[PDB]
Fold Methenyltetrahydromethanopterin cyclohydrolase.
Amino acid sequence: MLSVNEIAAEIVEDMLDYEEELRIESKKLENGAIVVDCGVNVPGSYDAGIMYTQVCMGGLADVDIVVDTINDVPFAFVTEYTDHPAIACLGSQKAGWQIKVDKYFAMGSGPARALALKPKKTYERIEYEDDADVAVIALEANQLPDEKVMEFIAKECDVDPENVYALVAPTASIVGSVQISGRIVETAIFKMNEIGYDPKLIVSGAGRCPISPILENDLKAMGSTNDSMMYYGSVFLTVKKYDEILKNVPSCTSRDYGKPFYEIFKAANYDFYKIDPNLFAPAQIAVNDLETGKTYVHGKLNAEVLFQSYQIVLE
Amino acid sequence: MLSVNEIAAEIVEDMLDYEEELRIESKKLENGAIVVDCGVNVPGSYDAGIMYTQVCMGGLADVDIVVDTINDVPFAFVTEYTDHPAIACLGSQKAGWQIKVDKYFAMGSGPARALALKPKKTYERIEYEDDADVAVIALEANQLPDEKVMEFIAKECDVDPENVYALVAPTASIVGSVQISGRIVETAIFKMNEIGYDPKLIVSGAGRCPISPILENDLKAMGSTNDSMMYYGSVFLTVKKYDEILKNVPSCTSRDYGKPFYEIFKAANYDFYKIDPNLFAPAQIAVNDLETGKTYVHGKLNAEVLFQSYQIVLE
Amino acid sequence: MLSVNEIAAEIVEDMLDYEEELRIESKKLENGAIVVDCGVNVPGSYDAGIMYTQVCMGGLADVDIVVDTINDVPFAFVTEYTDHPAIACLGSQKAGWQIKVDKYFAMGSGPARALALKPKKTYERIEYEDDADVAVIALEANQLPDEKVMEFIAKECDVDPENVYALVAPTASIVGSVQISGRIVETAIFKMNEIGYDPKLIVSGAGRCPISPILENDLKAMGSTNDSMMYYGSVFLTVKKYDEILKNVPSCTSRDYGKPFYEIFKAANYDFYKIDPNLFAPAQIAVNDLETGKTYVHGKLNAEVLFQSYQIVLE
Ligand SMILES: C[C@@H]1Nc2[nH]c(N)nc(=O)c2N[C@H]1[C@@H](C)Nc1ccc(C[C@H](O)[C@@H](O)[C@H](O)CO[C@H]2O[C@H](COP(=O)(O)O[C@H](CCC(=O)O)C(=O)O)[C@@H](O)[C@H]2O)cc1
Ligand SMILES: C[C@@H]1Nc2[nH]c(N)nc(=O)c2N[C@H]1[C@@H](C)Nc1ccc(C[C@H](O)[C@@H](O)[C@H](O)CO[C@H]2O[C@H](COP(=O)(O)O[C@H](CCC(=O)O)C(=O)O)[C@@H](O)[C@H]2O)cc1
């Protein structure tokens, strides 16, 4: 068996060996839980962003950054791949655990989900559950979780708080930008599942996505980070059997294509968990079908919308 | 001295530490030989493909995967380089050992060739031989080798069977697609040697090549994997002295240019070793001549033919 | 505290474990100093170039090579990023120490500058000084430093010579080409400081730059390696507060821009003091302003001048 929590805990302990270089900071709370600030009160870094993404994907993906251009404008890009897409993406990376503890709110991602079974239906669908005595969660939030929050997470994962780790970064941070663009393969897998395609049929995925510039606050960053995938994210996927419904994966087949993600988020009263899950999707995909040996291409890139979302100023 | 077998053996041992993550499976045979299934009865993975390629190149190259686009369609690409091109490519990676043991047929690549001297002329031409007590071979086949096959390989390499490792994957597999596009620098070195240019004059090489989708069977896969290099493989090479003959390196100088490699394989009765070796060539090269300081560019990319070979379906 | 000398010394010790693979050769002098030849009397390699660049950047950057195309012509590129740009680029990588010992001259880069404080004004500007018992210098030179040179460097750094390391390569070598293109982020940081922008405002940078072919002598190579950045180097930067003066970062805003650098240099009778210092600058930048959340784009790519500089011969 592969344990996404045990594998990710090893990555976190490596992060902790390089705190200063990565521009992150950890603290152990009164109950023993370790909270790793990756961008709330510290800058974080590109490498912290890569490692945060690797942790979100349960250690079952390769994630790197390459610098390239869009209409000659330079950007950093995530390039990533996985041969465990259901587990890495739906069983771990998906932000499927809404954290609310009194006034503390966070979007919860990562391996801890596979112990707490959040949401239960995902684990039924992908036929995975972790078995571990350590839990690693990734929280997207503008505040660090305290003892009571970590005690709750530990309890839900059936682990002692002394064996829980949380990575934390806000949407508007370099770790935020990198880890969200690092969901490019996940966007495809998630949309495929939403339209009814069995994620257990997905063999592998590889993706590329520009990393958003950091906008002025977390609400605006929610828009630009998501627009990276929705308007400029590319995925090559391999599946056991093709289904014609897969033409509906790309974002250009959605009723809301052309709207900046910020507008979608605003219409959901700035509540991520109130957004229709059907609205998450990659810009373009190529699907290699093992059964027929064909590769079906769907979608398109849209630099014009991306540059608007990125608040680009040309001369 | 650089020992391609000792260096590659370390990579194989690393693979053995991550079998479930890599989606590979090893077995120790009754005679002690280690057979690592990288795609016959297991899926393998992109990372197993990278490591298989590294092994084929004797541990003397860098191999990685980056996701990028061709006419906006996403593909995974190999990006690779080496500063030991004659040894890594001709002395090791080249599939120069046709394995026939009774009914068992396989294409043999990798460091073990530098112990068995297969073919002998190659080692005379590159002035290299390994001296090791371990042998590592990479077999392209749709069946795993048994004790008798491994015993034969051991005997030919003058090592004990307990000191032989085999990596094995069929042409139609992700390891197959990665490792074959991972031959992009080798294709150039191989063609240069075929046209009479001394490979000892080659200082280094760097290459890029898309990774083929997996087609519906090994016969079709032989075509699409090879067409990756012939129609869309690019190599930057450095040489000590230029020769005008190098204008004939690219595939577009062949009379058979434009033919799908599948048709070439079919014409060879689906026997790789019956293919005219003059057909192996990269699409495009740049050759930096150290003597004059000039860089000569030859060849062209051909996305149109590539997409036909890849069985792309556009909307 | 991050010690650029201690971090870089670890990278050099790694190089020393792989000399034959990297095609480098070290010598331990009578006084214990270690001189690592990376391209004077040895070929060096792409990987030795990467490691030389990492050392120049004090171990505080990520540096890799990817193969890609310019107008379809294949080149190797450096892709790199850092979240310590002031220290890594100005405090370490910049070739800011002229080493003159009798008739020996070399331009010195790398971590040892942060012990010797060369030039002092830089360390005052970036508010960094290293405190280490080891010193690591990188010399761009066509001659290896002897005992007297190394003794001098050691004394300037207040370290014993048994704890000094020098990496050395000439301009016309693969390590020269890689390490110079590996200055792409640095040339932005340096130009920014030279036009009055406080480098303490710079959060991070990410850059891409083609690696020059090796030209026929060091003088030609000085031109083509510089032109890689000036005519084809791209940088994505993040800053705390953008200033409009950053429009003057790109090389195309210099009065001397337009011809390959070798032409500019020969016209100036080989005198650096007669060339606009503002020419030494990246081709194009995108600057993410954390104040406004906008990203400002300046400059342009110039493949036509690059291909002249690179002595490209098309059919
Ligand atoms: C790229 C996105 N954007 C983004 N932006 C920022 N700033 N930060 C982030 O972390 C992300 N993450 C990304 C998204 C994709 N992550 C995410 C978003 C919202 C959620 C919301 C919910 O709370 C969540 O728990 C899920 O949507 C629930 O998921 C379910 O969807 C399915 C529900 O329907 P169903 O299963 O009943 O339908 C049939 C049922 C029939 C049967 O099989 O029995 C089926 O699927 O088979 C089910 O399979 C299960 O997997 C979850 C994850
Ligand atoms: C990119 C290429 N394509 C590619 N594709 C795939 N899917 N996997 C791979 O590993 C590679 N490697 C790459 C290449 C460049 N690597 C490679 C390619 C070709 C070779 C050898 C080639 O086959 C070539 O050099 C031939 O040996 C020359 O051909 C003659 O040499 C051979 C020697 O004669 P024989 O002893 O083989 O004669 C008989 C006669 C035939 C008969 O039996 O009917 C025999 O073998 O049985 C004979 O086969 C004859 O045809 C070696 C390595």
